[model samples]
Target: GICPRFAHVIENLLLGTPSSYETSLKEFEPDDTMKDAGMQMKKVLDSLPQTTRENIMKLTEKIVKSPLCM
Candidate 1:
């Protein structure tokens, strides 16, 4: 929705990951980028209506596999 920081994070992911997916080579530890993106992305997530943030976050387990998280 109004995810500004999310937008940039996605852009980096698309631009950075799209190319890497086809050829898995080298080890630069890009997972760190996701951590960075996650923290930064929260800015946009929390910037939205607090209620909307909760709605999205509530389903995070849905993303991570709800039953698995438990």
Candidate 2:
């Protein structure tokens, strides 16, 4: 329902982004559910490359600064 809107934030911290976004929205909690998949996806992301990481990092900044995470 409304939680998926904030799903990105949970995995944002899980994917190693700043947890400040996570702190701002605590509607969802990490557990054995998506928590397991989140880490798995993060590992896959790590293999992508520095350039891809850069893209993701910058995009998250905007999402955090913008209303996407709100």
State which candidate has the highest TM-score.
Answer: 2
Q: Which prediction has the highest lDDT against the true structure? A: 2
TM-score of candidate 2 versus the correct structure, residues matched by position:
0.44
Q: How well is each residue in 1-67 modelled by candidate 1, as lDDT tens digits?
A: 3244443444433333433322222233447666565445445544567556555555542554455
lDDT of 1: 0.45
After the best TM-score superposition of candidate 1, give how far the Cα of residue 4 lies from its true spot, in angstroms: 28
Once model 2 is optimally superposed onto the true structure by TM-score, how far is the C-alpha of residue 62 displaced, in angstroms?
Answer: 1.8
- Those runs of model 2 whose alpha carbons end farther than 4 Å from true positions after fitting are 1-29, 67-70
State the lDDT at 40 in candidate 1.
59
What would you estimate as the lDDT of candidate 2? 0.57
- Estimate TM-scores for all models: 0.33, 0.44
